[PDB]
Amino acid sequence: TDQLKKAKAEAQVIIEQANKRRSQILDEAKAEAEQERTKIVAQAQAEIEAERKRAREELRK
């Protein structure tokens, strides 16, 4: 029937939209994870440099 054909079409849209949404959410999660990893690594680098500076300060006191 035409109602069954409409239903199948809607079903396909639902499946395609769910897949697309998950891809979008995953893409955003990855972008956010990268922003975070960059900040964490930068913070660690700063701590490394700070310790070297402090060590040098103590040695020349």
Side-chain angles (χ1 to χ4, degrees):
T1 65
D2 290 307
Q3 173 207 20
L4 279 166
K5 186 181 180 183
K6 176 180 179 179
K8 176 196 172 185
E10 299 178 304
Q12 297 183 83
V13 172
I14 288 174
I15 299 170
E16 293 183 350
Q17 298 302 308
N19 184 64
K20 175 168 177 297
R21 179 177 183 179
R22 276 191 292 270
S23 182
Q24 288 174 155
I25 296 167
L26 186 54
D27 182 62
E28 180 52 30
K30 282 182 174 295
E32 285 179 38
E34 170 285 329
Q35 289 182 341
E36 180 188 63
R37 178 167 284 178
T38 298
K39 174 175 181 178
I40 289 183
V41 167
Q43 291 178 130
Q45 284 181 55
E47 290 285 7
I48 286 174
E49 288 171 56
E51 179 184 41
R52 297 182 65 80
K53 183 173 184 298
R54 287 173 180 176
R56 288 192 292 264
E57 308 199 312
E58 293 291 348
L59 294 173
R60 78 167 80 80
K61 186 172 181 177

